[PDB]
Amino acid sequence: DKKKADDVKFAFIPKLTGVGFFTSGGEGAKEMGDKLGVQVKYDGPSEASVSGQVKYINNFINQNYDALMVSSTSVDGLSQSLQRAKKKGMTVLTWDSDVNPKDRSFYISQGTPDQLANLLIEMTSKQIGDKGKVAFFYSSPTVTDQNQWVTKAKEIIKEKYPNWEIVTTQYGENNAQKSLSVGENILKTYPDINAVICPDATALPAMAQAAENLKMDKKVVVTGFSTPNVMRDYVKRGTVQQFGLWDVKQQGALATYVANEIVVKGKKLKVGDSFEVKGIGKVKVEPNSIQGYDYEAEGNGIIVLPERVVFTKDNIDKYNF
Numbered sequence: 001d002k003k004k005a006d007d008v009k010f011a012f013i014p015k016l017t018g019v020g021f022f023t024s025g026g027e028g029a030k031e032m033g034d035k036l037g038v039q040v041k042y043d044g045p046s047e048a049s050v051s052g053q054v055k056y057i058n059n060f061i062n063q064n065y066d067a068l069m070v071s072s073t074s075v076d077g078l079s080q081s082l083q084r085a086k087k088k089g090m091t092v093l094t095w096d097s098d099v100n101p102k103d104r105s106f107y108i109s110q111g112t113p114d115q116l117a118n119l120l121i122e123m124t125s126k127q128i129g130d131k132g133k134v135a136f137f138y139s140s141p142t143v144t145d146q147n148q149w150v151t152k153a154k155e156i157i158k159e160k161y162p163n164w165e166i167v168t169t170q171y172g173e174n175n176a177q178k179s180l181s182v183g184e185n186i187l188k189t190y191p192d193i194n195a196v197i198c199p200d201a202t203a204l205p206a207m208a209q210a211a212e213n214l215k216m217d218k219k220v221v222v223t224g225f226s227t228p229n230v231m232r233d234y235v236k237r238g239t240v241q242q243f244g245l246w247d248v249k250q251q252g253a254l255a256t257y258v259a260n261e262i263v264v265k266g267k268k269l270k271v272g273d274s275f276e277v278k279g280i281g282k283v284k285v286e287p288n289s290i291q292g293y294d295y296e297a298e299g300n301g302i303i304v305l306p307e308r309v310v311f312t313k314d315n316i317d318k319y320n321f
């Protein structure tokens with residue numbers, strides 16, 4: 001091995017704290033840290049901003065952390081600080097939301113844009129059919145992950161659902177209050193809207209709540225991505241019939257596991273490599289091209305979760321995160 005477990009520390013950084021998705025991801029990363037005998041600190045800003053993330057990243061670098069695992073608010077905004085981390089000899093991973101691939105080594109991904117876009121579209125089309133007015137409602141027009149998925153989803157919709165119109169795209173800024181206001185405004189301005197597609201953990205519950213507040217629940221289809229602990233009662237009331245995610249606790253755990261392989265065990269992971277992690281399953285390192293990127297380099301790539309999850313009333317109580 002390259003190191004001893006007790007001498008290392010890893011930083012697990014969310015887009016922001018105080019959102020169930022991120023708390024649960026952090027719990028998974030920390031639990032795996034405990035299982036491996038390595039220290040993992042979960043911390044980040046309380047609002048989603050590039051400058052906030054840069055401040056935390058700089059602090060972790062300056063405290064001589066061995067690895068950073070970040071879900072990014074930006075494609076390029078973290079580049080300078082992540083490059084500084086790499087130069088210091090730190091291992092830089094992303095999870096959830098990627099950065100420019102040259103600025104990290106591995107991205108621990110919940111799925112490709114095609115996988116996730118097809119999920120959003122299929123969950124919607126099962127409920128509204130091939131004709132309707134739809135809106136997209138998510139965090140921000142610049143965040144890496146959601147824009148990768150939505151760009152793909154819009155491409156698929158234009159071709160495969162020519163009788164859908166995307167009437168609007170709105171942003172809730174990872175903020176519950178803003179998201180509720182925006183969601184209510186969608187219903188007030190487009191009272192005949194058929195579905196709102198919400199690939200953001202804050203926008204989706206806000207949209208469900210907006211529908212309930214305005215007595216449009218069960219008239220408008222609301223689907224997207226969020227955590228089951230946040231969505232459970234909306235599903236049981238029937239306001240949301242189905243929505244998607246993936247095991248975010250295992251995602252955080254996988255990030256810690258990979259950091260441990262690299263930093264403690266001294267493994268040199270390459271595209272094409274594969275391994276198994278108990279409680280997660282078999283995973284492999286894929287090229288950056290699976291995300292649409294044009295960059296490849298030795299020891300750089302994407303590790304995708306084996307499965308995603310579609311939650312309905314039939315399985316909502318099978319998941320705790």
Ligand SMILES: C[C@@]1(O)OC[C@H](O)C1(O)O
Pocket residue numbers: 015021071096097145146199200201202225226
């Ligand atoms: C769950 C999600 O869609 O919302 C916040 C996360 O960063 C996410 O994965 O994009």
Ligand SMILES: [Cl-]
Pocket residue numbers: 218220221222223238239240241242
């Ligand atoms: Cl619905």
